[model samples]
Target: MAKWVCKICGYIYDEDAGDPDNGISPGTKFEELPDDWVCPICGAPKSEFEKLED
Candidate 1:
């Protein structure tokens, strides 16, 4: 799966690094956003994210 980068806060969503804040990194997908998924820094929606190239 392609990784994501938060456009609002420039937060790169590393697939291997995972979301250290909520422990929701393991299953996170750019397409399958969790019901409560939001930017940790800016609290933006999944739409605020952009696909990244590894």
Candidate 2:
């Protein structure tokens, strides 16, 4: 799995710990997230996210 970060904010979307509070279960990949999914901290859309390198 991979991790993604919100460009508008410093929110890190970890695939190992999916956003359960936002209905995303653990192990969910970034690509699996809904198109409308936004950064919980900054309200940025999914398109505003960028993958983090390992």
Candidate 3:
């Protein structure tokens, strides 16, 4: 799994530790998240996120 970044708010979504506040479980991959998933910090949609560098 890889990490993703919220382009609008700079929130780092870690695949190894998903966002529990949004019903995302740990070990959840960025691509595995729902299409409607939003950035917990800024509420930006999944389309607003970008793949993070390793």
Candidate 4:
């Protein structure tokens, strides 16, 4: 699992979440982000996202 950044609010997507409402699906991986999945907080496009290396 990888960390995903929110373009608008810079909120890193949580992968350890067991809920589907985590913005992304429960089993959604970083590299698996849909080409059209927008940020739930600000609705930013995936192109504005960056992979975190923490």
Candidate 3 residue-wise lDDT, 1-54, digit = tens: 788888888999999899998899999998899998889999999998889774
Runs in model 2 with CA error above 4 Å? Answer: none
In candidate 3, position 27 carries an lDDT of: 98
Clashes of each: 0, 0, 0, 0
**Cα lDDT of model 4 by residue, 1-54, tens digit:** 667787779977756551266446666775666677677778887777787885
The prediction achieving the highest lDDT against the true structure is 2
Collision pairs in model 1: none
- Stretches of candidate 3 off by over 4 Å are none
- Relative to the true structure, how large is the alpha-carbon lDDT of every model? 0.73, 0.91, 0.90, 0.68
TM-score of 2: 0.90
Ranking by lDDT: 2, 3, 1, 4
Least accurate stretch of 10 residues (summed lDDT) in model 2? Answer: 1-10
Candidates 2 and 3 compared: the better one by lDDT is 2
Please write out the lDDT profile of model 2 over residues 1-54, one tens digit for every residue. 788999888899999999999999999999998888788898999988889995
Off by over 4 Å in 1: none
Please give each candidate's TM-score: 0.69, 0.90, 0.87, 0.66
Tens digits of per-residue lDDT, candidate 1, 1-54, equal 467888988987766666757657665665655767788788998878888764
| Candidate 4 local lDDT, residue 22 | 41
Query: Alpha carbon lDDT of residue 31, candidate 4?
Result: 63
Number of the candidate with higher TM-score, 1 or 3: 3
